[PDB]
Amino acid sequence: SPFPLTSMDKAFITVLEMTPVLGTEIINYRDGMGRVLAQDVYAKDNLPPFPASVKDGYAVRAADGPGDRFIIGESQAGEQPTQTVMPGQVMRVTTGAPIPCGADAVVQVEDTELIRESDDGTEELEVRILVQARPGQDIRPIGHDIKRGECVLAKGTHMGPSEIGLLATVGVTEVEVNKFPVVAVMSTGNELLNPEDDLLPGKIRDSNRSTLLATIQEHGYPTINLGIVGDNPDDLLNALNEGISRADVIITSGGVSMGEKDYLKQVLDIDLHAQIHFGRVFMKPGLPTTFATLDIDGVRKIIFALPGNPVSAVVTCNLFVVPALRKMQGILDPRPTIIKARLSCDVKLDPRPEYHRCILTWHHQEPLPWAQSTSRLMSMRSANGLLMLPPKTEQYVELHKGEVVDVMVIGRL
């Protein structure tokens, strides 16, 4: 029947509550960007694993105090020194080099004066130490940064470049992570042609498939292109069955209003036997947005049947689909970032919550960004926000330039 109007808050919670978290797999750490760890990661070595110089200078005995010293040799990075530093002696050290036995502090070269070098001038022989070194000064002790057996990354961690670096550091080059969802995208309608086609009478080009696939790809998830499907229940069923076989998530657009050749809801329920959780949402745009799940064996497939209007499709994809994908790939709090911004122009409110693509810009020293709903130069930039306008009331019927509003971040700022 005509599905109940579902509130935006209920629809959103329903998507998150009903979306599964995918299983795990082992990956190479270099492939970890944007992955969520499904294991704790432990250090199997100390960092540094030897006492290491913080400075270019000399390894000394602090008890020697300031004075003139014989340079017995050099500790070079990458090699364990063999000599022991005795009273009256020092060893040259470079940053990251091991501290030799017998030394207990480092004096940086700027707190020294060279006395004697070799004739060719390539070897230092004697040096004046000008300061009283503090015990342990300018040395990183064994384990100062990381200790053997320390947990350096917890399960649940959403990895960026520095986490990949940490895995490299501790030598943990394979890790268990959640899988990424595979997302299949289909367009529907007898009027649709491919982008590559010249127009024919009564027809237009399919843009949603491209826009949706790009949106998903921007977030790093693998995609499947299911093409254009006609307004025909058998064709829709066959396409959905392909999507279900090939992917974790199916996204369709078009054919979800109550029109005569809108078949998707019927096919989902009667033919595919999916559970439709909502089929209308009280929102602008996006009224006919539909969310269904299908359990086959012990696997839950998710299906988003988005409106056909191109603006509606991209808006609802960002509101509903992206957070579900984030939950599927193991992100613990998959909610989008919502920031406060100032309206750049007056806006009339609707009885429905309204959503509009916008561009966020910071002005000089002003603390809040401005939100400009999509000058010449502005066109050089792609939308990076979704303005989230409140429903109207007897009190508030309009918002004014400068008033503070919620904006969901949808692109790299």
Added chain:
Amino acid sequence: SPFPLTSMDKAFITVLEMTPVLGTEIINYRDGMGRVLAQDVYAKDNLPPFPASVKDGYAVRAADGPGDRFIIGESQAGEQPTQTVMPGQVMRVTTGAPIPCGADAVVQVEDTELIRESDDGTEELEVRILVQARPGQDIRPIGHDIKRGECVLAKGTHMGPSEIGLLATVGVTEVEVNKFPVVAVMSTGNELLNPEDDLLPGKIRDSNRSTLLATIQEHGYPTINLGIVGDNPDDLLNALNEGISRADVIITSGGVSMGEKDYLKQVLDIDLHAQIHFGRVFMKPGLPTTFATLDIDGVRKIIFALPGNPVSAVVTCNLFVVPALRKMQGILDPRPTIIKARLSCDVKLDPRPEYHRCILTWHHQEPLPWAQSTSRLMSMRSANGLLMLPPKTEQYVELHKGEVVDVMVIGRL
């Protein structure tokens, strides 16, 4: 010699001023994410290309007024109607369907009552129109959204999903764009082992290469892994020559301070014959950061020789390298987004401007985010900002929790 201390502002401007914009290439529109158009793009068709219904309803003659009408047929999406609507008649239409000849308005189904249908109930025969239609109501005229010959995207546009959708819409499936830079990354030092290696005496694992490659990959640029190179001028030269052959940009780390086995600056100048624009920057961390260019034939190569300390390397990569890469790939204003945030803890200022990775978080309804320099839960998130602290003065020697500071965005918020 010991290079002059360059201010942060000068170093940053120097990088942008000396970095080239790469040439152009033709790509398929599906590959356009993050690319910058090097051509204006024009529509070769109207959108819609026929007069199109906005609603499910009936195509009517407004001059008929309200009343009872014979339904002569249906205009279905994807097909040009053949019948003409005469006085006293209407045609069913669906959203996106063409308006038949003879009709000049659409009345939505909710403003109608069905009078008669076929016995099987699959065909509507007569309908009551309850309203006086406004001329042209609920019709998108030819060219309403886009006109043939209109410029729909300007050169200089940095493309996201909606721009890809627009290309699909107008059927422009190949476009001229700036090339992306290819970025080669090398680590240096005799003490370094690969991540895959067990430790040996005096050695540590190479983490910078992984962190830097991931940082670059996060921005979408192709990379080349040049491996680990020893503290040896000949090996460094050979590696740099490989990077120059294989890539547009070379990033090294390590070996740029004035230590005894730090050879990079010498190799760059004497052996590679590159022009070093700065070799020290008055900043914390990142003092020894070095930027050079090399012109070969009519091609300018860029070389960033970053400090070896892992925190310094990732900070300077975000401050200097990423903006240069953005200029190379044709972004007109390649500067990073800097936002205002509140300090989550007291901080002492240094004579040098200081930079620290942080996490930005919005709290409930507070307009400004909090910046937390890198609770348990916080560790689940990767750094998304770089705190930019001002140099100290006689006046300001510390900043307090809650004070507003600049933060450069370095991850998806």
